[PDB]
Write a protein that binds this ligand. Structure first.
Ligand SMILES: CC(=O)SCCNC(=O)CCNC(=O)[C@H](O)C(C)(C)COP(=O)(O)OP(=O)(O)OC[C@H]1O[C@@H](n2cnc3c(N)ncnc32)[C@H](O)[C@@H]1OP(=O)(O)O
Ligand SMILES: CC(=O)SCCNC(=O)CCNC(=O)[C@H](O)C(C)(C)COP(=O)(O)OP(=O)(O)OC[C@H]1O[C@@H](n2cnc3c(N)ncnc32)[C@H](O)[C@@H]1OP(=O)(O)O
Ligand SMILES: CC(=O)SCCNC(=O)CCNC(=O)[C@H](O)C(C)(C)COP(=O)(O)OP(=O)(O)OC[C@H]1O[C@@H](n2cnc3c(N)ncnc32)[C@H](O)[C@@H]1OP(=O)(O)O
Ligand SMILES: CC(=O)SCCNC(=O)CCNC(=O)[C@H](O)C(C)(C)COP(=O)(O)OP(=O)(O)OC[C@H]1O[C@@H](n2cnc3c(N)ncnc32)[C@H](O)[C@@H]1OP(=O)(O)O
Lengths: 881, 881
């Protein structure tokens, strides 16, 4: 757990090799050779009973004979010695170990032994790790490595070797390269936490097959991706691959939803992985999504345009002033527009003139340069002149460059030169377009996740009634419920349903059917098989009573012949007037073994297969996320906009989805929910048929989800000295405008005291950072009071903890005109109580002398005060909270 | 046009270079250098007034000074000299010319000049052509070339150079390489006709941007692909690309349909083009679709499996006996199944043993071998041992091998070694799967096009009634017709429609609505209104008499208040059709400027965008092709078989599509047809709303289509000497079983006379060859008589022409027991009349001197008879066909 302890693995001062050997075909031999060639600054200690020296290095007979305690150890021996060697290492005092091989029946003993001695293990069957900046190569890989700024994490040795070979071809390096093996003790989330703070790393790439702890992964990825881009490839999308990899449990749309919610992006295949390596290594970050293209030929540009159109990209438009490329610069047979075709006989000088003129403008955000083989412009010379021209231009640092030099045999030297100058290069124009659109989409998703949500209109949630009804249902032994029984539960949360009636025989069915509209639907009450399709028990559109009697008798007869023993409660009759022009939708909620409950949206009438015709999301939902889900559904053509005559209403559907999310979050007894179909008619949404599967539950009900929901139990009413009453509660994303006003009503000196600097404005991004928090790692309380249905913020306090949950940093601020009423003390006391109950061990803060009020309050609250004059700093620390 | 005239271009004996020069930067200099370096067996003659010699070759001052007439000439000069130089060449007697440069305003004069002198032209704006086996490089390209068996045709210079460079990297060659430029005179269909007969060519690859004569292209590709595979890539799918290339007139789904109908396969992007080059060059033809996979790692195999699943491929299943693998030295920890994962520590010997055992079995049709970098199995050694093992195995020629060696830096030499031995190799597993599935799909499409159609249900086609009604409609200035007016026209061809009876004004609207007291289809329309969105009229929950009254009266008020100027019209009644319960479909027919009329099938989701939600086909259709269209629609998830509760009836939909095709083929006055709500309710299909746009026609009906339809006008009744009456008509694909019986009733000696050999079998493929013909290039007549609703064939004749339409080979055969009644003479006379009318010049045939009857009949018919004894052959020729 503790981030302390990974230091020995990633920055060791000494390493021991157990099983080093002189035989050239042995694993110990290869590991020793790699370590000696790495460039390490510490000692490498071989341990073996069969040799007095290995590759010129004096050896030691056994572990106990070592002159001192090694930082890191590697086992290169048969699995049958694992436990004894591990025990000896634990006795010696080593704290980190890499294990070459082990069967699956050994995991429990290994974990117990590691716990006994407080040792960390890198997954068994691991290839190893490489850290070029420390000159460390502790791996069994036959491929060399070079220094760089990209980090890679893999759960597969073959992929690791392949990527290393690709990097060798292109003269590119890394900052860290780690193989996880079986991930018994050390796992992906800890490494993400570590890499988020490494100064030499600027981007992260991952290949994954399975996970064990979803919430920690989501939180770590969300925290890490705030300042560095992260991409992921995940295999095993088909039944045969799942069987091959032994990962049959789980569902792939859940992976899609989880990856999207954390701010990452998924790549599809091997080619895109290589392109991602190139792009993350060399491309400059984007400032927009306008593209400009120039070429010495038409057809390659046409192919690029087709690729761009397939992905909904945007072409840049030239201005009238920039169009002076016609006047003198270029010959008269070149048409001036985007894309710019310089023709087959273009020379390098044309390229340079065009590049200069284009760079001195502001009409685009990225530039694509295409070159095909030609006599008038040899590849190497044109590449050299391009590199020089880009180097010497004053405004080159404002746009992103991309190069695509076609011709495999004649472009080798040009590509080599591009690599050493730090400019990205690609093999085909379609690949270039794909690489560009990847980053465009990444930025779009990150921006979309952070817009300000609106307040919800409806606020109805009668939790107690729903629990009461569900408890009564489970008491009798019921395991599923139908529309008639489910209507009150849905109504308790503000959802409408079509009325239905119960009939015990065909006579009553006919009586009620004629009492209502004759076009009706009949449904048997089947408690044995709840499946509609099994017996095909739903039939509809019966215009005449005679049809009703015939259908009822047919159902009864086929039941008594096919399956008489089943218990019969009667039929269900409902009027269905002719309506299909109203749009029909389907909503399903299911439980994933890995990520927990999942919400899916799709079309109603058609057959159900979520892998291809459904969009997904993780609860809990607010208005913004539900809107995002609906708009994704519309864009991907899986949901037809205005399928009915009336256009679809987005806001009402978002509200309904929010209500469904509330219901699912509140009641853990529900295992599955299905609305088939949901009728959309303007601003009216109604449920036609609905089913629920229920079961007893025993747990906390908060650890169920991958994202911690809003902690409603922390709300509390307080009374001040003057008698005023207010509410203390956690902060919400919807609070942004009121926070803007609150900041507006604070003086400059108080802002200087709070933020230790001068602040003239807070943008939307800072406010979003303040209001949209992860409740597992951060907490903030606000004090509010209501005036004529409008809230108002009086103060705020905050605490930010470390990933290990040991230390946290605190702050507090009160409105300038409400100083001496006791708000600060109450806020701080509530924060102290919460942090102590959460499991933290310390609070830390920093302020300056001449902030007398804060120092006095901290002394009143029991803090330890450290005034360091001559540096103008005061330290504050509180122990048991 | 004339296949004779291409010999000078493709196999010249001498060449003249107009405008050769000694300046290294001139085009003539480059052409001269290429030609002298190519290895030509003839003379190269430079013509220029500015040099006495060029690159050591004596020069001549002008064209008139040449010592003899050259076969081929090349123009390397400014476009302003084109016409004068061409006139001089025509005077000298040259018959072929390549033109470097010309603007679009010159085309008419160039065509006229070429026609005057009987000269063929390549280009203009053409890169040239290369023919390695003749040692000829007459082109302006800077990339070298090598001998091979693949041929390539391109409409783009940059793509040509890129492909040549790619081939240079991989050490592969070509048989012919030709660039078309503007295709003013020489075009694609003539080149396909020529390449179909070239002995050194075994496959063909094309890059295209536009066409000018669809009929000839389709026919030529159909003929050529019978014995050689052909792939195509076509760019310009988006409006921006179309604007860039000046090809906005066409429609891409028409290209899709045309490519499919001719038996070819379309490739998507640049990567697939490179893979296609590799596959056509090296892979052995498939005999099945079962795949086997082995690897030295799991994850690459899993990626392969995912790619295979996404394309609906088939995995092979091992037999129990092949469990020799468990014994044959594979370690105990390897699991025996497909894919077979030899572990990371696999050695070369394991590979060789597995390969031997697998090759000695019959469980699969293709084998994929994956290798990742490792210490135990170095790349080069493993490749060498694999090559030797494959070379020495007796059964290697029964399966197709594919290799995928990952790791760019370390596998260069291995890929080179694979190239020299003729084994295909690919960069990534996904690419390998894609390459395999391309050929699988190609074979599947070719097989599907040739199954036996079933006879139709003797549908009605009253052409006279439909023509009379359409002429009456146009006589009154009508430009479009609605459902009421088009009901009889649809009924004439056997298609059901909603009822069409008259009704009076709005006061009678409610009365006719209540005439049955339920919703029913009443139409109120404006004919001048461009759009139908104003109507907003659909009968859904306009049920109750109160509903009828109120809604209908309000609708009348709203509809009639809108527009005073519009010419309003009266009412007339139709009945309600249920569409909510039933499944809704859409059918549209449109006219394409290139390929002619097109038929589109869709789901009918209100929103209509054929580019992504429709399947397409070319008329005329029979039952087989219509079924193929429907099944394609179902497989792509564009139309649901289960949108309604009732399963979809394929046969009835096929029959309906055939009826629509008949209607469209018969009546050229129709420009567009739209059946928006086509209802399917099992075996019942009815049209709800339908529109027709009509216009006068003045051309030739048969020439509108890309495929010549069945020539019904050639049927004729004849009576024989004995008085029996029978029908002579062209052959049909539906005649296969009757032809089988007819062949069954012929004696062995007559079969020897007919086929000049002993034949003990006619498979389904030979019969398909006999019965499925292209009517523009082949004609066959059968004589049939009716017996109790069952037909029987008495004889058959055939004539197969050449693409130039000058010569044709003929044959005849009569049932053994019906000889001596006049059938042979009548069949031959009908054939002679038809061939003379078609425009052929000559008829040829061969037989043997013991066939007295044929010789006597040919003498009776006026043939010239030449008997060559000592060789056992008799030649027959008739001079005017
Ligand atoms: C994740 C990856 O891709 S790693 C690269 C791919 N390679 C692999 O997956 C294969 C890994 N496995 C192997 O190499 C082998 O199967 C092994 C090493 C696991 C087992 O080999 P074995 O012969 O069973 O090993 P064993 O433990 O008996 O002996 C290994 C060495 O340890 C030495 N040794 C024995 N006892 C001890 C001891 N107590 N302390 C130290 N060394 C010892 C033995 O002398 C032997 O050395 P030597 O051959 O020079 O005399
Ligand atoms: C953590 C960091 O990085 S430092 C940032 C701290 N925040 C700021 O400086 C923001 C600006 N200041 C403020 O917001 C407020 O002044 C705060 C938060 C410092 C204090 O909140 P307030 O509402 O003013 O305090 P409150 O009324 O609860 O006072 C509590 C105790 O402080 C004492 N106190 C407050 N100000 C002073 C003062 N200037 N001198 C002496 N005692 C003081 C009061 O006597 C009271 O004592 P008591 O409980 O024994 O009767
Ligand atoms: C895709 C490809 O084809 S590769 C890329 C090239 N693409 C292109 O479109 C072609 C590029 N364009 C060019 O090279 C130039 O524009 C050209 C060749 C078309 C015209 O150049 P111009 O200088 O106008 O040609 P012009 O006809 O005047 O002279 C060319 C040569 O013909 C010679 N010439 C002049 N009159 C005659 C004549 N009656 N007969 C023969 N030769 C003649 C001239 O001497 C000159 O030779 P020189 O340079 O050794 O003195
Ligand atoms: C076509 C090629 O390239 S060669 C392959 C030719 N095909 C065959 O040999 C297939 C086997 N034979 C047959 O199918 C038939 O016998 C055919 C096609 C040769 C003749 O067709 P038939 O129906 O027998 O001929 P039909 O009755 O029309 O006779 C036409 C004339 O031929 C004459 N004739 C036919 N057979 C003979 C014969 N063996 N000897 C002399 N005269 C003959 C008849 O007298 C008649 O003459 P007439 O018009 O002056 O009265």
């Amino acid at each position: 757990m503790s981030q302390r302890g990974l230091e020995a693995l990633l920055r060791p001062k000494s390493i021991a090799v157990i099983g080093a050997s002189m035989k050239p075909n042995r694993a110990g031999y290869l590991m020793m050779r790699n370590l000696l060639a790495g460039g390490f600054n510490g000692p490498v200690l071989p341990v073996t009973p069969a040799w007095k020296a290995v590759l010129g290095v004096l050896a030691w007979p056994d572990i106990a004979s070592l002159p001192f305690t090694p930082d890191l150890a590697v086992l290169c021996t048969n699995a049958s010695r694992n436990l004894a060697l591990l025990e000896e290492l634990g006795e010696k005092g080593c704290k980190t170990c890499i294990i070459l091989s082990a069967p699956a029946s050994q995991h429990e003993d290994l974990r117990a032994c590691a716990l006994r001695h407080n040792m960390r293990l890198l997954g068994p069957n691991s290839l190893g790790l490489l850290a070029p900046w420390q000159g460390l190569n502790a791996s069994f890989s036959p491929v060399p490595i070079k220094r760089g700024k990209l980090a890679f994490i893999s759960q597969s040795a073959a992929v690791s070797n392949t990527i290393l070979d690709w990097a060798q071809q292109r003269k590119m390096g890394f900052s860290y390269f780690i193989a996880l093996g079986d991930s018994l003790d050390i796992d992906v989330d800890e490494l993400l936490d570590y890499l988020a703070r490494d100064s030499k790393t600027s981007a992260i790439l991952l290949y994954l097959e399975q996970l064990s702890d979803a919430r920690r992964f989501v939180s770590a990825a969300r925290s890490a991706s705030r300042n560095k881009p992260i991409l992921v490839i995940k295999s095993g999308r088909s039944p045969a691959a799942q069987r091959l990899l032994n990962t049959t449990a789980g569902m792939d749309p859940a992976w899609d939803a989880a990856i999207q919610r954390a701010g990452l992006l998924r790549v599809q295949d091997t080619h895109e992985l290589f392109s991602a390596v190139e792009t993350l290594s060399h491309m400059r970050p984007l400032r927009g999504d306008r593209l400009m293209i120039i070429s010495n030929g038409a057809a390659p540009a046409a192919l690029a345009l087709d690729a761009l159109w397939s992905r909904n990209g945007k072409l840049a438009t030239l201005s009238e002033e920039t169009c002076q490329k016609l006047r003198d610069a270029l010959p008269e047979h070149v048409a001036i527009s985007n894309p710019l075709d310089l023709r087959d006989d273009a020379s390098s000088e044309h390229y340079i003139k065009t590049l200069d003129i284009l760079l001195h403008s502001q009409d685009f955000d990225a530039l694509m340069v295409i070159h095909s083989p030609s006599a008038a412009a040899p590849a190497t010379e044109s590449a050299q002149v391009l590199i020089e021209a880009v180097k010497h231009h004053p405004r080159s640092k404002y746009v992103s460059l991309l190069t695509n030099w076609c011709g495999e045999h004649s472009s080798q030297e040009a590509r080599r030169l591009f690599s050493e100058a730090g400019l990205p290069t690609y093999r085909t124009p379609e690949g270039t377009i794909t690489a560009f659109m990847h980053m465009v989409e990444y930025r779009r998703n990150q921006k979309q996740l952070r817009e300000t949500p609106a307040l919800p209109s409806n606020l109805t949630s009668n939790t107690a009634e729903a629990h009461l009804l569900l408890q009564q249902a489970i008491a009798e032994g019921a395991t599923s419920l139908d529309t008639h029984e489910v209507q009150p539960i849905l109504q308790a949360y503000g959802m409408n349903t079509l009325p239905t009636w119960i009939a015990s025989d065909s006579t009553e069915a006919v009586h009620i059917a004629e009492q209502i509209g004759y076009p009706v639907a009949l449904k048997l009450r089947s408690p044995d098989i709840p499946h509609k399709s099994e017996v095909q028990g739903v039939m509809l559109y019966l215009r005449t009573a005679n049809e009703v009697q015939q259908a009822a008798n047919a159902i009864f007869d086929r039941v008594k012949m096919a399956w008489p023993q089943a218990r019969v409660h009667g039929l269900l009759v409902q009027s269905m007037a002719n309506r299909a022009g109203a749009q029909e939708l389907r909503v399903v909620v299911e439980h994933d073994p890995v990520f927990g409950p999942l919400i899916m949206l799709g079309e109603g009438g058609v057959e159900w297969r979520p892998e291809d015709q459904a969009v997904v999301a993780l609860p809990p939902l607010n208005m913004n996320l539900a809107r995002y889900l609906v708009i994704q559904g519309i864009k991907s053509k899986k949901i037809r906009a205005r399928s009915a005559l009336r256009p679809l209403d987005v806001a009402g559907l978002s509200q309904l989805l929010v209500q469904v999310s509330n219901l699912i979050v509140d009641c853990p007894e529900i295992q599955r929910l299905d609305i088939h179909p949901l009728l959309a008619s303007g601003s009216e949404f109604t449920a036609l048929d609905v089913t629920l599967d229920i079961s007893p539950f025993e747990g906390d009900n908060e650890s169920r989800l991958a994202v911690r929901p809003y902690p409603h139990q922390l709300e509390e009413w307080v009374e001040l000295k003057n008698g005023e009453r207010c509410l203390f509660r956690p902060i919400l994303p919807e609070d942004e405008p009121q926070l803007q006003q609150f900041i507006s009503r604070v003086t400059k000196e108080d802002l200087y005291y709070r933020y230790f600097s001068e602040i003239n404005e807070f943008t939307h991004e800072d406010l979003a950072n303040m209001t949209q928090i992860d409740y597992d790692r951060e907490m903030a309380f606000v004090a509010v009071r209501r005036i004529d249905q409008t809230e108002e913020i009086l103060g705020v306090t905050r605490a930010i903890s470390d990933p290990d949950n040991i230390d946290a940093e605190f702050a507090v601020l009160v409105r300038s005109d409400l100083k001496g009423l006791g708000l600060g003390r109450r806020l701080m006391e509530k924060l102290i109580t919460y942090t102590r109950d959460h499991g933290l061990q310390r609070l830390n803060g920093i302020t300056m002398p001449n902030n007398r009020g804060m120092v006095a309050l901290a002394r009143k609250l029991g803090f330890n005060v450290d005034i360091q004059l001559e540096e103008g700093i005061v330290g504050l620390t509180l122990n048991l909270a």
